[PDB]
């Protein structure tokens, strides 16, 4: 239900390729995305389980 769950996934300015999870409100599920390694927003989780616990149902 938090609004940050509705924000698009944020890769950020750093240039690593790190697998993370974000909640996709259109999908109603968490999906993977590329995280650059710095400046993460809140719709950014290390597991789908963690992702759904915080953002599921948003």
């Amino acid at each position: 239900r938090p609004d940050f769950c509705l924000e698009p996934p944020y890769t950020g300015p750093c240039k690593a390729r790190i697998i993370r999870y974000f909640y996709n409100a259109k999908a109603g599920l968490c999906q993977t995305f590329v995280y650059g390694g710095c400046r993460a927003k809140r719709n950014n989780f290390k597991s789908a389980e963690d992702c759904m616990r915080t953002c599921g149902g948003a």
């Binding site: 750093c14 240039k15 690593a16 390729r17 790190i18 590329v34 650059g36 390694g37 710095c38 400046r39």
Partner: protein, 224 residues
């Protein structure tokens, strides 16, 4: 690497990759047992791969060596990215051959206009997101600090410099981080960050390796 080309197969023996279940960053072999990378590429456990051209097709020249020590610069700032540099000590010395060998540390700072070689397995943006199996290369000039600060008002610290093209279209990108910017055979830069990849007026920002030669030498010596 965006808007570059496939590196000659044998040609960059100093280019390594950092792995933790998958390829997540690059690095540069600066001595038989030491690798330079970016601090934001830090992970608790890392396996370094050496001698790769195609990360999915082994040709027999590849080495797989665990990181024994992983040391971020003590002044690394995870918010501003100041001092984005890291040293890795391999658990055993790399076997040196044509496909695996060292690159020189810089003996003078980057000079504006100098043409450098940036490399890595980063996103190419060639068909939307495209993470290539084959190592990619980019020829790109060191930009002036003025150009760098004009591109990134507020963000360019003393540890940083820009290499690339103000017109956009050619740049380093995600998965390239920690990898080399080599100018005339010397490691002048570490791939660090940027606003997007290959955007107009937003060239890649790189860690100025020359500023850390003493720290590198001291760190290596302290961990013999």
């Amino acid at each position: 690497i965006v808007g570059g080309y496939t590196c000659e197969e044998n040609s960059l023996p100093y280019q390594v990759s950092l792995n933790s279940g998958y390829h997540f960053c690059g690095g540069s072999l600066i001595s038989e047992q030491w690798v330079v990378s970016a601090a934001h590429c830090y992970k608790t456990r890392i396996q370094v791969r050496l001698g790769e051209h195609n990360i999915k097709v082994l040709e027999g020249n590849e080495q797989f060596i665990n990181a024994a020590k992983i040391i971020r610069h003590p002044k690394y700032n995870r918010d501003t990215l100041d001092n984005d540099i890291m040293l890795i000590k391999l658990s055993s010395p790399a076997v040196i051959n044509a496909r695996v060998s060292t690159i020189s540390l810089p003996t003078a700072p980057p000079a504006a206009g100098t043409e450098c070689l940036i490399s890595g397995w980063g996103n190419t943006l060639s068909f939307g997101a495209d993470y290539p199996d084959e190592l990619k290369c980019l020829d790109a000039p060191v930009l002036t600090q003025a150009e760098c600060k004009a591109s990134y008002p507020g963000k360019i610290t003393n540890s940083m410099f820009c290499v690339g093209f103000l017109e956009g279209g050619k740049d380093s990108c995600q998965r390239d981080a920690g990898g080399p910017v080599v100018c005339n055979g010397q490691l002048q830069g570490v791939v660090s960050w940027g606003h997007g990849c290959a955007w107009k007026n937003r060239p890649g920002v790189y860690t100025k390796v020359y500023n850390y030669v003493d720290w590198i030498k001291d760190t290596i010596a302290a961990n013999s």
